[PDB]
Amino acid sequence: EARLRLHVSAVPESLPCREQEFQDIYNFVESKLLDHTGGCMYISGVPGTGKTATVHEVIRCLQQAAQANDVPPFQYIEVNGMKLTEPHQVYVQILQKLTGQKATANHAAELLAKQFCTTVLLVDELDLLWTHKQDIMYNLFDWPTHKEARLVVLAIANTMDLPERTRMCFQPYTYSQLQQILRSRLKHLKIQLVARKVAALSGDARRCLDICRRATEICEFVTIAHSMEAVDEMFSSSYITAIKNSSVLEQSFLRAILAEFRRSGLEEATFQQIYSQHVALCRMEGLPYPTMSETMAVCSHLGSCRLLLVEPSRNDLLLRVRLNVSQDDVLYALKDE
Amino acid sequence: LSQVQRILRERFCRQSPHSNLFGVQVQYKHLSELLKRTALHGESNSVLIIGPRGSGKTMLINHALKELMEIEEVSENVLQVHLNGLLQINDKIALKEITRQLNLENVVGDKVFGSFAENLSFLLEACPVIFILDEFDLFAHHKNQTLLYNLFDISQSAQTPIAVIGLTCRLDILELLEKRVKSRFSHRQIHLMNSFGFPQYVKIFKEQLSLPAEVFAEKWNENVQYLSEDRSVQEVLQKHFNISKNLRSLHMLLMLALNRVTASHPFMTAVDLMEASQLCSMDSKANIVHGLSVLEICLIIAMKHLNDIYEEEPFNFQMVYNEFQKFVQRKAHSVYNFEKPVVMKAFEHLQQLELIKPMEYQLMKLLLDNTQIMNALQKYPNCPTDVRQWATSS
Amino acid sequence: VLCRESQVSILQSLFGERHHFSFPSIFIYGHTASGKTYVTQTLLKTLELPHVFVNCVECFTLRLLLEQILNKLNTCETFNDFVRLFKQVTTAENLKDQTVYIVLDKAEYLRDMEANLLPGFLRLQELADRNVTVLFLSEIVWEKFRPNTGCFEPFVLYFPDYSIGNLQKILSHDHPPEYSADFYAAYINILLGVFYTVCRDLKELRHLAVLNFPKYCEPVVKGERKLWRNIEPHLKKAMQTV
Ligand SMILES: Nc1ncnc2c1ncn2[C@@H]1O[C@H](COP(=O)(O)OP(=O)(O)OP(=O)(O)O)[C@@H](O)[C@H]1O
Ligand SMILES: Nc1ncnc2c1ncn2[C@@H]1O[C@H](COP(=O)(O)OP(=O)(O)OP(=O)(O)O)[C@@H](O)[C@H]1O
Ligand SMILES: Nc1ncnc2c1ncn2[C@@H]1O[C@H](COP(=O)(O)OP(=O)(O)OP(=O)(O)O)[C@@H](O)[C@H]1O
Ligand SMILES: [K+]
Ligand SMILES: [Mg+2]
Ligand SMILES: [Mg+2]
Numbered sequence: 001e002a003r004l005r006l007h008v009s010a011v012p013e014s015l016p017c018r019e020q021e022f023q024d025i026y027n028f029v030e031s032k033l034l035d036h037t038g039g040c041m042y043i044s045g046v047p048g049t050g051k052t053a054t055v056h057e058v059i060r061c062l063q064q065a066a067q068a069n070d071v072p073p074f075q076y077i078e079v080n081g082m083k084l085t086e087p088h089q090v091y092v093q094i095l096q097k098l099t100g101q102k103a104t105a106n107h108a109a110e111l112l113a114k115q116f117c118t119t120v121l122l123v124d125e126l127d128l129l130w131t132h133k134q135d136i137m138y139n140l141f142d143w144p145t146h147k148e149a150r151l152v153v154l155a156i157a158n159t160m161d162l163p164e165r166t167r168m169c170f171q172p173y174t175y176s177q178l179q180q181i182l183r184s185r186l187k188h189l190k191i192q193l194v195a196r197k198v199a200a201l202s203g204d205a206r207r208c209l210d211i212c213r214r215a216t217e218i219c220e221f222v223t224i225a226h227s228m229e230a231v232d233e234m235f236s237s238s239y240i241t242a243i244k245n246s247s248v249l250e251q252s253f254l255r256a257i258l259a260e261f262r263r264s265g266l267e268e269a270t271f272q273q274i275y276s277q278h279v280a281l282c283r284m285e286g287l288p289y290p291t292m293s294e295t296m297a298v299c300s301h302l303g304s305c306r307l308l309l310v311e312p313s314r315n316d317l318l319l320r321v322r323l324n325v326s327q328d329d330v331l332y333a334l335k336d337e
Numbered sequence: 338l339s340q341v342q343r344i345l346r347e348r349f350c351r352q353s354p355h356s357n358l359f360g361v362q363v364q365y366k367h368l369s370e371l372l373k374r375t376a377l378h379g380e381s382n383s384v385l386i387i388g389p390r391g392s393g394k395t396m397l398i399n400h401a402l403k404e405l406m407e408i409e410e411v412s413e414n415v416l417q418v419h420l421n422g423l424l425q426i427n428d429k430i431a432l433k434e435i436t437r438q439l440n441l442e443n444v445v446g447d448k449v450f451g452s453f454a455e456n457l458s459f460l461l462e463a464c465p466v467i468f469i470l471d472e473f474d475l476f477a478h479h480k481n482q483t484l485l486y487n488l489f490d491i492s493q494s495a496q497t498p499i500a501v502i503g504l505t506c507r508l509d510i511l512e513l514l515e516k517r518v519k520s521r522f523s524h525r526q527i528h529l530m531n532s533f534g535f536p537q538y539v540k541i542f543k544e545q546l547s548l549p550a551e552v553f554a555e556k557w558n559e560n561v562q563y564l565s566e567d568r569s570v571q572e573v574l575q576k577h578f579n580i581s582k583n584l585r586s587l588h589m590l591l592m593l594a595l596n597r598v599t600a601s602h603p604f605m606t607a608v609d610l611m612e613a614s615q616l617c618s619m620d621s622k623a624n625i626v627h628g629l630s631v632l633e634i635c636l637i638i639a640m641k642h643l644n645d646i647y648e649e650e651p652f653n654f655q656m657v658y659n660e661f662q663k664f665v666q667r668k669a670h671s672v673y674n675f676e677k678p679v680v681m682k683a684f685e686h687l688q689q690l691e692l693i694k695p696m697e698y699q700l701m702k703l704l705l706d707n708t709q710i711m712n713a714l715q716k717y718p719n720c721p722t723d724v725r726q727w728a729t730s731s
Numbered sequence: 732v733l734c735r736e737s738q739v740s741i742l743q744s745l746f747g748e749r750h751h752f753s754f755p756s757i758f759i760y761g762h763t764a765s766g767k768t769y770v771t772q773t774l775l776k777t778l779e780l781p782h783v784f785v786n787c788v789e790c791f792t793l794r795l796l797l798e799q800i801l802n803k804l805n806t807c808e809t810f811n812d813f814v815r816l817f818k819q820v821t822t823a824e825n826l827k828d829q830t831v832y833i834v835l836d837k838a839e840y841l842r843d844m845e846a847n848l849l850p851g852f853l854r855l856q857e858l859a860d861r862n863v864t865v866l867f868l869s870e871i872v873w874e875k876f877r878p879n880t881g882c883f884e885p886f887v888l889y890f891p892d893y894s895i896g897n898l899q900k901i902l903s904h905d906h907p908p909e910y911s912a913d914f915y916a917a918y919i920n921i922l923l924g925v926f927y928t929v930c931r932d933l934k935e936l937r938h939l940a941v942l943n944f945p946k947y948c949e950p951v952v953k954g955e956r957k958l959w960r961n962i963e964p965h966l967k968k969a970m971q972t973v
Contacts, residue, residue: 007374011381012494047520082486082517083454085429092451125517128481158516206493210524221370234525238387238508245531248579275706287579291620292706294580296874297884304881305389306509313877314842316622316704318694324509339748346752352857390881395857423847424812424858434812474880475847506881589886592754596744616741619889621760621872628762628892631928675929675971691871718894719928 002188003216009185010213016057017180018050021170025058025154032152033062033072033118038144040153044160045170048204051156052124054170059120076120081128087136090129094121109139116149127157172203182208194227239325242305243333249290252281253298254330257308257323271299271310271319341557344548345595349588354399357544359537359584361397364528368401368502371526375465375500376405376415381492383501384526385473387510391585393530394504398469417467422475428453428484431476435468436460454487458495465498473503477513485514489521532582535575539565541584542574546591546605560604569607573614590614622705625690626713631724633683634717635661635673638728640693640703641710645731651700654684664727733905734897735770738890742774745886749780749829754886755856758838758876759868761890764933767868770890771834781825782832787840793848800833811851819859831863839869842876849876853883895927902936910948918947921959925966930973939969 016022025041032039045051065071077097079090091108095101098119100111121140123129129136144151160169173181175196182195198211215222215230243254256277260269275295282290296313299321303310309322323330347353358365364386374380386394406412418438425431432453436442441460450456468488470476476485488501503510511519533541543565548554564570577590594605594613602609629637639660643652658680665673687693688701695701714720714728732739745753759767768784775782783803790796797808804821808814833852835841841849851858852865865885873887893901903919904912922940930936947962 007380012496047517080452080454082481082483082490083452085453085483089451096451204520204524206520207524214526217370221366234527238527238529241529242389242508242531245582247532247582272706288576291618292622292709293620293872293874294618296877298580300877300881301389303879304506306507310879312879314691314875315694316691316875317706318702318704342747343751346747350754350856351752351860351862391884421858423851423854424815426810426812426847430810430812472880586884589884593886596741596747599744616888619887621874621887621889624889624891625760625762625870625872628765628931630931679929679971689870691875 003191003219003222005188006186006216007213009188010209013181013185013209016050016054017177017184018054018170021050021168022054022058024168025055026061029058029062029120029152029154030065030071033120036072036118036150038146038149038151038153040141040144040155040166042155042157042163042167043170044162044168045158046172046203047158048206049170049172050205051170055122055124055154055156059122062120072118075118076122078122078124081123081125084128087129087131090123090136112143113139116143116151117146118150118152120152120154122154122156124156125158126155127159127162173201173205175199178205178208181205182212191222193224194222197224197227198231239307240329240333242307243325243330244336246302246307247298249282249287249294249298250302251334252285252287252290253278253295253302254307254334255281257321258327258330261323261327267322268320270317271296271321272317274299274321275317339600340553341548341598342595345546345591348545349592349595352396352399354396354403356396357541358397358400359541360533361393361530364393364530365397365401367526367528368397369404372401372405372467372500375467375498376411377408379465379496379498381495381497381499382526383489383492383503383523384528385503385505385510385522386528386530387505387508388528388530389532389583390506391583392532393528395471397528397530398502398504402467402469415465415467417469419469420471420476422470422472422478426475426479428479428482431484432456439463439466453483454490457487458491458497461491461495461497461499465500467500468502470501470503473505473510474507474513476503477510482515482518486518486521489518489523492523493521535578538578538582538587539571539574542587542591545584545588557604564605564607564610567607570610573610577614577617590617593617620709622692623709623713623716625692626705626709627717629687630683631719631721632673632675632680633687634714634720635664635724635727636680636684636687637692637703637705637710638724639664641705641707641728642731644703649702651696651702653700654681654697657684732766732770732773733901734893735766735890738888739770739774741888742770746774746778746780746830749778751830752856752862753830753864755863755883756853756865756867756885757888758873758885759866759888759890760870760872761868762870762892762931764931765890765892766933767890768834768836771866771868775832775834780832781829782834784834784836787835787837787844791840791844793845796844796848804831811845811848814851815855815859818855818863819861822861826861829862831861832866833863834866834868837869838867838876839871841867846878850878850880850882853885892931893933895923898927898931898933898936899923902933902940914948915944917956918944921947921962922966924959925963926970929970935973939966939973943969 028041043051059076062071066073077094079093084090088105091105091112092103095103095108095111103111123140126137140153143149144153178201179196179199183192194212194215198208201207211230211234212227215227218226218229256274257269259277260273278290278295299310300313302308306324309324311319348356371382371384375382386397388394402417406415416439418435420431420434425434436444439460441463450459491497492499492501511525514522543561546561547558577586581587590613593616594609597609597612598605636657639657640652642660643656658677692704693701694704711728714725747753761767772784783800785796785799787796790799794809797811797814798806801808801814801817806817808817855865856863867885899919903916907915919940922936926936926939943962943966946965947958950958950961
């Protein structure tokens, strides 16, 4: 249970290492809350930057403050866009969390309009609420600006351009910031040459905890060598691996592709042209003739694993073939030996 | 007796749950490891088994899942859910399929929950579950990806024991996931299956044909080991190896040669496998050409002359008709001369066979390779000396 | 059945014993008149193996194709999801332990229907694990069926075109109604001697064999061998027209 207790600490965690962002959001809600007014704040960032976690923290703190009467009471509501099949179910959620309970999306939206013509509403990943007419976004952002509406809106998504089609952004995590979170809870061990090794990344936090959690799995069955192995089992590109393990005729077919490309110089060629090249190579390697039924199988083996991008098999000799891997990568996979 | 057949048929055709695991020793450790961690402890993980098709995945996960549930605590406390991208084409179908495999059909339908996640969470809360997603590629293609996102979202932040194990053949899988789902996927837990060495292939050949401990089996295995080394079986197995590097293709080869074994032919021979190999090596489109009428052939030779004259430009019936008329013109008498509607019937039959493709007033291009044509003509049973001379005119 | 004897030995031994397992999928190709389904139905009828036979051009949709296959086993069916469900739920002392056969004729039309339907059928054995064999037969080469993500590759069995000799032996000696079979033989040998180079379809040759038979033997009843001279211009009248 020594280095095994370090397993238990990776999957979720607390408390935040985003110190400055937290304060900004707290003061935003506190400002709007103290005044008995509404507002909206859009939060950008990379998927791993601690946006929803920080918000949840700010909420728990504001509820504590609401118990001592430091800040006005009370209610809070959260809904996730990716948790719904059909965007319009949002109106049901919001209403169901408030009074009035169940109703259709049409009747709910009408009711929310009535209520809004204090409450904190978190809409996490409203990128999913995009619709042709975008009525729901227009409503969520219009509601807090009504006189009779006291509503504070916190909108999370991954892109800065969303509101362009009262704002904040979470930058990706740096060398030191990631290094911080890992040792931040290693307190079982107060092994730390690794925490900085894994810490060079782009830019998610989940990568760190999941990577190092795998490193411990390597150790048992932690040094820097264990983490290099951990990363090489994850971020390592599988394409070059597959080309090395591909069969004989599969490689000759790639050589055929590269031959046709070096002739034309384009990124597309037809199975017919590639076929002529493949015949030439099989002739020069002492191989048997590449029966077109075989070569079609091969070309599908390489298109099933996405080494190739191939037109549907119905087109027969007119298949147009693109490489899903850069020519330099293939030459390196074939020529390494 | 036929007891041989009953065995190899469940091994070759159906996929034998128990067999020898070749070269997966590392990958099995990582999968079985993770599986203990989610089943025995309260940990939640997600992993992808990624290989070419026909090798690896489904047997690995099947073998791993079996050994896992042989633990008494596991069999009682662990539920497993098997999903497939072919069967469930919609995340709503999948939701109701999870509800079905979890024996949670007692919800029952009276509460339609406000959100997809709320319905999924309500199912798990009614205690680990191992989610197997086969043909993971297709689950990535569902609209906004609700099933993947919320399974990973539940795998990470919900602390409900769950195991999300995908199977895919795509080296491109990770690029098919949204930024959000890619993050929540326990990052790039990846098992790769791929291929082996030729000596390992031959050892596999002899191991799959041999019979287990079940004097009849002992005599059988001695003869297999004799086959393992032969200049014939080996030069055939290599030819298949240079294409396959796959145990499923091998299984087919062993199966076809297994029909050759009867009560009058007790055990396989070199010829049994050579014949079985010949059936697989046939060129399908060459076989189809062999059965055309001499009219259809002459049309293809007309099309051949048209691609060699106009430089691979498409053509229509008219110009084919003209070039074909130039063929019968040689003799004043009518031998191959037929009425235009009939020639077009045969022409339309070539299209009906998808030996010509469109893009008469429609332009089309020939789907045959010239070496297929000249080889077929030499192998054609009745081919008249006149059409052969015409074929080489170009 | 004649001249297919070799294909019967391959396709019969593949069936093996009925309680065994067979290929998850088999794909037969060949021409219209190759005799594919005549051989398939006989083998399924004679033994007699439980089976179903369905025409893919008749059923264009899923509802129709899948409801036929389910009904014919002895049932509202939308998506292939519920076929494995309700095919797996179809088991009894009749089907319990045995190989079940599903023959999809003109599978070439499956390509145009539903993306997941042809793959689901190729693997149907392990999807329901019910000991099934799906038999595809079409005039289109297997190379054109393959999808992007792939599939379980079936066994590709080739039913070769009938030769001119295979045609006569099948076409002639099996209905010599009013005469010696040698007389009807010389008749067919002349029939093919004209129409073969144009029409190789056994189906159509049987028509013309029936059509022009009376005129061929008319000089016999009227008291007038070597009748090739008699009907050849008449046969050539029908050749370039029919
Ligand atoms: N500073 C941190 N300390 C501890 N854990 C962190 C930190 N930053 C991120 N995490 C990890 O990230 C998760 C919190 O989610 P996060 O706030 O990144 O969601 P999100 O950014 O809204 O999700 P997405 O951006 O993908 O929509 C936690 O479960 C934790 O494992
Ligand atoms: N390393 C191996 N150990 C055991 N059997 C193997 C191995 N590699 C290939 N096989 C055989 O090849 C077949 C592969 O089946 P499986 O479904 O497990 O993977 P797959 O065919 O790639 O799956 P998919 O349906 O995604 O293509 C099995 O019948 C199995 O017996
Ligand atoms: N050996 C034979 N003896 C007698 N008749 C035969 C023979 N072979 C084929 N036929 C003829 O062909 C018919 C059988 O159809 P066949 O088996 O050619 O269908 P199919 O090949 O499955 O059709 P398609 O290929 O167009 O789907 C019989 O009814 C008979 O008219
Ligand atoms: K059987
Ligand atoms: Mg979020
Ligand atoms: Mg599989």
